[PDB]
Amino acid sequence: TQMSSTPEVVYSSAVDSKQNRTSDFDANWKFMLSDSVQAQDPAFDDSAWQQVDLPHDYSITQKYSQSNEAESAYLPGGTGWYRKSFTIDRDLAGKRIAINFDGVYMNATVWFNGVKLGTHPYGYSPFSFDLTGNAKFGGENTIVVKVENRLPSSRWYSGSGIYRDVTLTVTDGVHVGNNGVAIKTPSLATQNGGNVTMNLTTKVANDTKAAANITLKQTVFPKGGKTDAAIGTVTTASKSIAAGASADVTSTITAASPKLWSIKNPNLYTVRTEVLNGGKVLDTYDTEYGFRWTGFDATSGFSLNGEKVKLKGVSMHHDQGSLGAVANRRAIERQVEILQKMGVNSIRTTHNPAAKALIDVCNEKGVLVVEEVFDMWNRSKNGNTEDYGKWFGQAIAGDNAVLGGDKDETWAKFDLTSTINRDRNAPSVIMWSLGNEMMEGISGSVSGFPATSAKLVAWTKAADSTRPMTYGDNKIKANWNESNTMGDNLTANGGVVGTNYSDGANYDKIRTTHPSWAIYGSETASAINSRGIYNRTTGGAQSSDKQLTSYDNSAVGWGAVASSAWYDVVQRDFVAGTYVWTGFDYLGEPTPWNGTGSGAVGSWPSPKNSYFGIVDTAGFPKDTYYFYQSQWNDDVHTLHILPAWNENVVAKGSGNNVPVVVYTDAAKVKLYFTPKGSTEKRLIGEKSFTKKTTAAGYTYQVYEGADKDSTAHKNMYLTWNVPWAEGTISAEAYDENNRLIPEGSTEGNASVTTTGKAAKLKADADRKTITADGKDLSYIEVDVTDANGHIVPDAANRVTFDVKGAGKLVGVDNGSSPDHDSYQADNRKAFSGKVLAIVQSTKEAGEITVTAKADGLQSSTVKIATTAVPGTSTEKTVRSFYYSRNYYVKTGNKPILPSDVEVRYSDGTSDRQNVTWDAVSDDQIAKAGSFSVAGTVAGQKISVRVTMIDEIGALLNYSASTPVGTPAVLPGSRPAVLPDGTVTSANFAVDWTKPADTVYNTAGTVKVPGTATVFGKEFKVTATIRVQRSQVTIGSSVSGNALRLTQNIPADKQSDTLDAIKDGSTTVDANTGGGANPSAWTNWAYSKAGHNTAEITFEYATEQQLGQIVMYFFRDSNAVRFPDAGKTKIQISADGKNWTDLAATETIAAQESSERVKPYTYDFAPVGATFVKVTVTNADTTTPSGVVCAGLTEIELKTATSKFVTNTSAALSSAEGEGNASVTVVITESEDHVTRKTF
């Protein structure tokens, strides 16, 4: 008979010349998550695929799983397929067409109309493909992107897919190049106020079969204004450009007193370049520009446009919380807004190129961007074997037609040059950061690094002379040689040197040791706090309740608290600024509950997001935020109190005394307390700041009274000890002249109060009007208050959102790290009294009513209006058609097409109307191949794909591999094989008789039967899946990379040199004639004092994935003796506090490795350790000296990596497939469904 695909919503997508040069291409893509499918061919039946609008993250929608890794948010990646079908109007004949991706994470492969264009590994750099050569003009075309985010690939939540805008560029054959215009104003600093010299260079490509005679007409005018407001023009002399050649065309414009781009006044200009042949304009290319200049002085730091500025910076990862990696413009904009309110003036794009959207935002909003291109270089971090390290140094394939950067060297060059090409004209970008902690979390020699650095520096210099390059190095603090060489070379090429995690003392060491260097804190603080937690005042370690104090006393081992990292910076004019880790919490890296390896950390649900943020994933500030504001925002006055004032949440100690903290930019603060129901405020105390100002003119405040904190940095804020009592702690603020600061004008909580029980929801939306573009967002904060409207400190009431109208709920969040509730749910628990709902617009104007509801609490309701995009027609238009477009008919039978199809309109109305289908050739009916059929409805042309089948021999069998503990995902469908060799692109839905999930919890092969009914005839298919364990490979020692190596033994009773045990040598110096041994460590001293044991502890700044430990114990004649078997013990932790015994096997080697050195090898399954404490117990023997001792020359802590290997072969053995390949009866398919070899 015939079978038909189920009815899908068909959107008609069209590319004509009526469209703008570059057009949004985000809409109407089909997506499918599938490790197995092959969807490259335009014929493929994508009817059953999910329709999505880009940008889109396909990781964020999958479910959390302990088999994944903490760093990457316990969320999976895998293989995603995007397909989009569209007509190219025949008016585009002659024109050139290109597709542009701003980001695709990661390992993208692109086909156009079945032709494979190429690949792009890196997940954050932008890239392009030409479609011209392969386009079918006046016809149906199909672009296909295959995204393979094979984990592990990130130390943070990557997300997966096309997470950033796609566009189409249509141009004449003679056109300005990709990112073709480069603007320089070499003298602006000098010319400022007068006429400014602009030097343009423009790549003009002649992609025609004829030499071309071209002139450029360039015009600089204010962005958003008309050309007649230009402040400069030029028209070039004729340049002849040969056929299929291109040329760089230099021009100069004189700008009539351009308005400077500044932080306060981010004035932008447009620079339009027209390509002229004869009279006619062939191409017109705009680029956004700002007039601005920077300077770096090694003593007085940074300056913008002549004024001295302090870089008050945050590091920001790319994800947008509950929305995942999706680079939604408004999401991104909102982040910047919140940061600006904090007093931020700079963002470091840690550790990868930003979305253009961010750059765009920063350009208009006036924020300095340090755009970082890379994290790791040629060596991967944290055993993320699939991270860009894999690709950094690889050459580009000859057949790879990817575009955007230089293809003549490595991916590194391409990705770097591509990013610079995109952003070269952006006023906001002040520096190119070329790497981050390049030598952290890696293995093997680093001697190559300084050379790799220079290579990158050179490339950058050549790519963009106009901005200093930089990096963020965390071994400057360790005085590594490599780190020093690299900074000289930075300095030598006009770079600024970023030190990560330096204390004040170290900042000073650098200046003295490196006077040439201009330095900043490239990454600072890394303080770890949750929002609204007050019941303790300590942290920096794994808590029982999976949260951390909001007081600024909690930080990682390598970092420091906010007070500290700012204090160390503000005081030193020569430390140009700070880039705090981080501005906003990000998904992944849940330090102190971090995991570089597979498995849950603590009890599940484990924390899945960060604690570093000043602001949580939802955009709710933590308390520390108001500290930063107090220190950074000179356009507001901060006066903020913590903690919240309820019995159950405060931290009582020293007789009911609770540390009350105040953050403020005021000169004097009087703190009052009012007992409940009373109306009389009792003054608890009064404190005055000291307003110091540095030589360069940066002015800060410290408290220097008698009750000042002993540790200096804590005096950047005020702390009182109030006794706990129901009531209201308020504070009033006075300026330098002792004039009171008005009660209204303060920012932050001017008073905390004891609250009632949870009573009402108050819900407010950030914007009451948004654009009806399917893009814009409204952010709805919901607080849980008592009867009087006081936010309830510990409220965790599950709130349910009812979204009705011209919108839809796209996310819900609370910024709670261990909450695993779906982001894409209609409900979520409040956390510390707050919950967020994100609502997105539709493409039709209307109203959105959103209702926050919770059990036993007064509902709240907000109204949001969506306004239509200017120029959308009020008269109703055709939207889409609902019908089945795929028909498989038996040969000799006429195709039975439907008489009618459901039509949708802009109104959302649905009318079923009739279709007049084209005639089907008699030849075609018995032809036994595929063809398309046109019809017409409501003026528009619909199409249907028909494939004719004579007979089907069988359906191809399937084979895969799965990790033990993870059930195999079986294919939705299987392809058809003719009695003829030929394998069809026609797939038929299979129903599997699935075994229990438990079957996959042991190693072995597993057969699963499944059957599909094809033209009434049921066919029998076997899926033979192989369940496998990880393949673990042990690496080299990382003892060298230790952040710290301490000793149990007190200072006075230590003997020999400890640091010797990570020096990479195993032998003992015989050290005859006394003195401390430089080659080895011992406990001789402590032993003599009668101490039986000793504890050596390695600390790391990143969790190490250990796979083996080898201890090189030694012996002498007098005292030191090899320890007894099984007595030496190892332990591991994530914080330095909570320990765990390493389950290991000891092997004492047969022979000594070197005279009087024997290696004890400890074996164990891979485990993550940020700390490793070896407890050495002396032998139970007697010695000539009568003192028994233990001694070590080296402790090698070897790392390990795990892969899940899936085989590649189509060959046969015993029939059976060699690499568990699918046997079909013999055509075969490898375990990786890539190579099918028929024999």
Annotated binding site: 1060, 1063, 1065, 1193-1194
The SS3 assignment for 456 reads helix
Q: Which residue has the tokens 């709130």?
A: 799
Return d(Cα 469, Cα 495) in angstroms, integer: 5
**Tokens representing residue 590 in the block:** 């849940």
Which CB atom, from 51 or from 1065, has the smaller least distance to Ca ion?
1065
**Tokens representing residue 1016 in the block:** 């009434």
Residues 1077-1106 that bind Ca ion (CB under 5 A): none
Question: 437, 482, 781, 1231: which is the annotated catalytic residue?
Answer: 437
Which CB atom, from 551 or from 1113, has the smaller least distance to Ca ion?
1113
Where the chain is discontinuous (C–N > 2.5 Å), the residues before each break are 1214, 1225
- CB of 991 within 8 A of CB of 1014? no
Q: Closest by alpha carbon to 1149, among 1114, 1177, 1117, 1199?
A: 1114
**Tokens representing residue 631 in the block:** 């220190």
Report in angstroms how near the CB of residue 1116 gets to Ca ion at its nearest: 16
Report in angstroms the alpha-carbon separations of 591 from 352, 596, 599, 1039. 21, 11, 15, 21
Lay out the sheet containing 954-955: strands in order across.
954-955, 973-977, 983-989
Report in angstroms how near the CB of residue 1154 gets to Ca ion at its nearest: 11
User: What's at 846, amino acid-wise?
Assistant: G
Q: How far is CA 1030 from the centre of its chain?
A: 27
**Tokens representing residue 1065 in the block:** 């040598």
- CB of 14 within 8 A of CB of 89? yes
Q: Closest by alpha carbon to 1058, among 1096, 1111, 1109?
A: 1096
Q: Determine the interface stretch with Ca ion among 905-913, 947-955, 1053-1061, 1133-1141 (rule: CB under 5 A).
A: 1053-1061
Question: Per-residue string for binding with Ca ion, 1144-1183, x by CB under 5 A?
Answer: ----------------------------------------
Which CB atom, from 901 or from 1157, has the smaller least distance to Ca ion?
1157
Report in angstroms the alpha-carbon separations of 13 from 29, 74, 96, 879. 10, 37, 18, 11
Which CB atom, from 671 or from 1061, has the smaller least distance to Ca ion?
1061
Could you tell me which residues are beta bridge partners of residue 999? none
Which CB atom, from 1063 or from 1163, has the smaller least distance to Ca ion?
1063
Burial of 902 (0-12, 13-18, 19+ CB in 10 A): middle
Cα of first residue to Cα of last residue in the chain, in angstroms, is: 32
| Angle at the Cα of 106 from the Cα atoms of 102 and 110, rounded to 5 degrees | 75
Q: What is the greatest pairwise CA distance in the chain?
A: 107
Q: Determine the interface stretch with Ca ion among 142-150, 528-536, 984-992, 1194-1202 (rule: CB under 5 A).
A: 1194-1202
Query: Is 1194 a binder of Ca ion (CB under 5 A)?
Result: yes
Query: Is 1063 a binder of Ca ion (CB under 5 A)?
Result: yes
Q: Determine the interface stretch with Ca ion among 210-218, 283-291, 1064-1072, 1125-1133 (rule: CB under 5 A).
A: 1064-1072
Report in angstroms the alpha-carbon separations of 762 from 224, 697, 767, 785. 39, 44, 16, 7
Report in angstroms how near the CB of residue 1075 gets to Ca ion at its nearest: 17
Return d(Cα 1055, Cα 1049) in angstroms, integer: 9
Question: 523, 589, 747, 1229: which is the annotated catalytic residue?
Answer: 523
Q: Determine the interface stretch with Ca ion among 353-361, 696-704, 1065-1073, 1091-1099 (rule: CB under 5 A).
A: 1065-1073
How does DSSP classify residue 813?
A: E
Return d(Cα 1001, Cα 894) in angstroms, integer: 50
Return d(Cα 423, Cα 416) in angstroms, integer: 11
**Tokens representing residue 11 in the block:** 């959107």
Report in angstroms how near the CB of residue 1096 gets to Ca ion at its nearest: 13
Total interface residues for Ca ion by CB under 5 A: 5
Could you tell me which residues are beta bridge partners of residue 837? 780, 812
Residues 570-629 that bind Ca ion (CB under 5 A): none
Q: Determine the interface stretch with Ca ion among 151-159, 854-862, 1058-1066, 1132-1140 (rule: CB under 5 A).
A: 1058-1066
- CB of 55 within 8 A of CB of 167? no
**Tokens representing residue 891 in the block:** 């040969």
Report in angstroms how near the CB of residue 1190 gets to Ca ion at its nearest: 15
Could you tell me which residues are beta bridge partners of residue 1069? none
- Give the other-Cβ count within 10 Å of 653's Cβ: 11
Could you tell me which residues are beta bridge partners of residue 937? 940
Q: Determine the interface stretch with Ca ion among 193-201, 425-433, 712-720, 1061-1069 (rule: CB under 5 A).
A: 1061-1069
Query: Is 1067 a binder of Ca ion (CB under 5 A)?
Result: no
Report in angstroms the alpha-carbon separations of 286 from 165, 731, 1123. 19, 53, 74
Report in angstroms how near the CB of residue 1126 gets to Ca ion at its nearest: 24
User: What's at 1124, amino acid-wise?
Assistant: D
| Known catalytic residue at 372 | no
Which CB atom, from 73 or from 1038, has the smaller least distance to Ca ion?
1038
**Tokens representing residue 489 in the block:** 């070379």
**Tokens representing residue 419 in the block:** 């990013």
Which CB atom, from 1030 or from 1065, has the smaller least distance to Ca ion?
1065
Q: Determine the interface stretch with Ca ion among 65-73, 251-259, 874-882, 1062-1070 (rule: CB under 5 A).
A: 1062-1070
Report in angstroms how near the CB of residue 1158 gets to Ca ion at its nearest: 14
Q: Closest by alpha carbon to 484, among 516, 445, 436?
A: 516
Q: Which residues contact 181 (CB under 8 A, 6 or more apart)?
A: 200, 201, 202, 203, 271, 273, 285, 287, 425
| Known catalytic residue at 523 | yes
- Residue set of the binding site for Ca(2+): 1060, 1063, 1065, 1193-1194
Q: Determine the interface stretch with Ca ion among 50-58, 708-716, 1059-1067, 1228-1236 (rule: CB under 5 A).
A: 1059-1067
- CB of 924 within 8 A of CB of 913? no
Report in angstroms how near the CB of residue 1066 gets to Ca ion at its nearest: 6
Which CB atom, from 451 or from 1149, has the smaller least distance to Ca ion?
1149
Count the residues in the chain: 1239
Residues 237-276 that bind Ca ion (CB under 5 A): none
Report in angstroms how near the CB of residue 1060 gets to Ca ion at its nearest: 5
Report in angstroms how near the CB of residue 1097 gets to Ca ion at its nearest: 17
Report in angstroms how near the CB of residue 485 gets to Ca ion at its nearest: 24
Which CB atom, from 155 or from 1198, has the smaller least distance to Ca ion?
1198
Query: Is 1193 a binder of Ca ion (CB under 5 A)?
Result: yes
The SS3 assignment for 991 reads strand
Residues 1016-1035 that bind Ca ion (CB under 5 A): none
Which CB atom, from 844 or from 1152, has the smaller least distance to Ca ion?
1152
Which CB atom, from 363 or from 1193, has the smaller least distance to Ca ion?
1193
Query: Is 207 a binder of Ca ion (CB under 5 A)?
Result: no
Which CB atom, from 52 or from 1058, has the smaller least distance to Ca ion?
1058
Q: Which residues contact 655 (CB under 8 A, 6 or more apart)?
A: 723
Report in angstroms how near the CB of residue 1194 gets to Ca ion at its nearest: 4
The contact set with Ca ion (CB under 5 A) reads 1060, 1063, 1065, 1193-1194
Catalytic residues, by residue number, are: 437, 523
